[PDB]
Sequence to fold (813 residues):
Amino acid sequence: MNHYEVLVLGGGSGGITMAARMKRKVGAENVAIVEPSERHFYQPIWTLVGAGAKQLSSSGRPTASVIPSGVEWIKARVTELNPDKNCIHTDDDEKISYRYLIIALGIQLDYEKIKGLPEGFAHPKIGSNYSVKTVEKTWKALQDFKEGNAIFTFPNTPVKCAGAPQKIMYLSEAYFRKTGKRSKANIIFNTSLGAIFGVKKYADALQEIIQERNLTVNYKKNLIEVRADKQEAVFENLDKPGETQVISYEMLHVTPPMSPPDVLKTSPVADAAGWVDVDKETLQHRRYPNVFGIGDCTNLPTSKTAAAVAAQSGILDRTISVIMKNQTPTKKYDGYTSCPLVTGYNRVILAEFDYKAEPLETFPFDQSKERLSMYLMKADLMPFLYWNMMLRGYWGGPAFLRKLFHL
Amino acid sequence: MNHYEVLVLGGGSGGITMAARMKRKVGAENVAIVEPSERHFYQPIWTLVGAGAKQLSSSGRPTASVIPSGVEWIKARVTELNPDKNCIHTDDDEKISYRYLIIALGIQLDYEKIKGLPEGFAHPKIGSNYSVKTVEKTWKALQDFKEGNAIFTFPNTPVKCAGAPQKIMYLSEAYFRKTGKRSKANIIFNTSLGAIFGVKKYADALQEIIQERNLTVNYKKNLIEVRADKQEAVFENLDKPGETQVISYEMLHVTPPMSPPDVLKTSPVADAAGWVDVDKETLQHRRYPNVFGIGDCTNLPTSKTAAAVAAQSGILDRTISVIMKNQTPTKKYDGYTSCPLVTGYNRVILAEFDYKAEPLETFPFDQSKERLSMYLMKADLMPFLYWNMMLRGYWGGPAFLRKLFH
Ligand SMILES: Cc1cc2nc3c(=O)[nH]c(=O)nc-3n(C[C@H](O)[C@H](O)[C@H](O)COP(=O)(O)OP(=O)(O)OC[C@H]3O[C@@H](n4cnc5c(N)ncnc54)[C@H](O)[C@@H]3O)c2cc1C
Ligand SMILES: Cc1cc2nc3c(=O)[nH]c(=O)nc-3n(C[C@H](O)[C@H](O)[C@H](O)COP(=O)(O)OP(=O)(O)OC[C@H]3O[C@@H](n4cnc5c(N)ncnc54)[C@H](O)[C@@H]3O)c2cc1C
Ligand SMILES: COC1=C(OC)C(=O)C(CC=C(C)C)=C(C)C1=O
Ligand SMILES: COC1=C(OC)C(=O)C(CC=C(C)C)=C(C)C1=O
Ligand SMILES: COC1=C(OC)C(=O)C(CC=C(C)C)=C(C)C1=O
Ligand SMILES: [S]
Ligand SMILES: [S]
Ligand SMILES: [S]
Ligand SMILES: [S]
Fold:
């Protein structure tokens, strides 16, 4: 069997980041990354790509160029995990064994669970900022919008970046005002959830925007079918099972249902729901002490964001070092995550909170306000920090900055 | 390869029931059931077996004994579903094709997601009414109870028969009074949920029982580990991530986390959560119009019960007949389900409700009262009606009875 001291499953945000940090602990020759994609994407900027403010090409780089230098890139898909025997299977009919395993497989998009998708994306007026293949379609639907309903959805599953399905709604609204067709737009957000946002401070600031900008939100309403050729969409009322509703659209932004990666769903390392079952504070796996998890694929009960990955990578780095010398981990992840809620082409409400879903803000000012500074940070500084600091293993979240300020 | 007009996946409550109904529609020779288990169990009576009021031997019959005559029993496990090619795969490497598919694969028990199970069951004082292998350990733990915490758990997943985890707690409480050792038992229900029951009328009834009979209920508390050799159970506080609590027990009753069967989790027929993705009124699959689902494996947003299965079976029978006649289905399932809440060795609160979580009571009296009549119905009549009417395709729930009593 091919064998690595440290095996990292997934070469996305958590996976590259954890590889860089482990390369410094055990040497690069002893780290490997299993990743099928030829290309590594900074997904947060896709919100702005779909609103025409950023280029798609700049959001990605060849996976080879972000593999930490000297680390083995195994270009393949994980097809099975066998933790009892400290190995995994790949779709190249190889098995790979490990001393330590870091699982960073992200979340899976399930567009096909919506009847009429993904074939419906072939038609005009419909897009999705969650896929490299549909994010520019969001922008063409917005550009081409003439008059009628502009509908944005939120599915009945866990998602990554829970703020993004409404970020694109606020940008669309601002685009209609800037181009003079706001009066011809009936803007609707049909969300499976019960509330605009999970934290009251930001929910409240967001509700104010909902009222001032004449947006409609229907709660407990899930998209179940798209008829793209007829520009109609079908939603179920999650509160009155069996009741559906058909509604035409001049533009539709689909946030797809999401789920754990298929290979984890039935794996021994998953919990009952298919997420990687790790300790909530140390990210060490609950039942296999040499397995760890980070990011979207875990069952960490906080928002699934890259800011969370950043904050988790700093904890996991310590956890693994403590475990490597048969000691009890002591530093504890707090559930830190962040949500740069783009409310316009020049504003962001920067939500930050922890496991108790209470504000944990970095800056000494009220981040519940729409801010130019926070927009520039998301649009311009965060991509640079990601490529040049987070992926090199030098970004574990802004806790030190927060304590630096409050001083 | 082998092909059947109607292929039924699963030979449990809905599988056998649907195969019987379909035999009458397409003929026995055109129906097949894929089912691996040699034994078919009437699971509801395990609540009473765990309490030592019924025998485990009587809850099961050979699978061969309930297969409708003429209907092919394919003794195997489904390992793959390919609805785009109208076929499924089994674990003896056979491709089976169908004209229509009924999926009745049930719900999967995931004991091993509780750290320390299922190896913990080898130790005394721990049991589980949800498994043929542990229901009798419940009753052993109940009799052997001397003094301490009697702990009953409810997981953080969907479940079948959501009432059964408290049913055995009430039975245990009555047993302790009847054997003089009630003063020696601290009885605790540690549930992942935030409410005792989702229908307020029956939740208020159970709330009075809890208060009158000195039971503790701790909400948002989820069992995560058993240390059966030390008789300790670990709970997480769902309201404060990171917080846990280690409790000693003298008796522990585990309700295991549950999930869609593994073969369905990654299947095209599943919704994103892994449940069979069916129309909530017709039970026809949303995306594969020759696929249907019934029972615990579906995403029907009501309680996962045998009574729901029976009411579903009448609807699905009509849905499939109408489709075969090139008509559009019209008769609608209302979410009917029933929970015969055993509150003691002589009493049942018969909860009956629909999709809107509103009571939908068959009998003209108040079923939120503890009733002897309802206990005898659960303990003696329902098993009889199950084996001899429901599994033969002649029980579609009690809606006709309801209308007659009203
Ligand atoms: C539109 C959008 C906007 C967002 N905005 C923000 C934002 O403003 N702020 C923020 O903090 N976060 C944001 N996010 C979320 C952020 O992108 C993710 O949370 C982050 O990428 C999670 O990192 P990860 O490593 O867990 O998953 P990913 O970065 O997605 O990486 C997972 C990797 O695993 C690989 N993989 C999958 N299956 C297998 C397999 N079987 N074998 C091998 N490899 C496999 C995939 O190819 C992928 O490379 C946004 C996301 C989207 C979609
Ligand atoms: C302790 C207990 C008490 C209960 N009490 C009540 C009660 O009072 N009232 C009530 O209404 N309900 C009650 N129920 C619930 C009731 O038993 C179920 O809701 C009912 O059995 C659902 O039937 P089903 O066909 O959906 O699943 P099941 O009856 O479980 O049948 C599913 C079948 O699929 C088979 N199978 C699984 N995987 C595969 C595969 N890969 N390939 C092929 N076959 C497969 C299994 O072997 C099984 O035979 C109780 C359940 C329990 C556990
Ligand atoms: C349909 O979406 C809407 C809401 O949902 C969040 C509102 O609260 C409101 C505000 C209503 C009050 C009484 C503040 C409006 C006007 C609205 O359109
Ligand atoms: C790109 O993804 C993100 C991070 O990871 C690099 C962050 O650390 C943070 C937090 C950083 C600060 C300065 C609050 C945010 C908001 C974010 O969006
Ligand atoms: C065996 O499980 C059960 C059924 O399936 C046969 C029922 O139909 C019903 C409903 C039947 C009546 C007479 C209300 C109940 C309560 C039940 O527990
Ligand atoms: S986000
Ligand atoms: S977010
Ligand atoms: S039940
Ligand atoms: S129930």
Summary: Chain A is about 25% helix and 25% strand. The domain at 109-259 of chain A is CATH 3.50.50.60 (FAD/NAD(P)-binding domain).
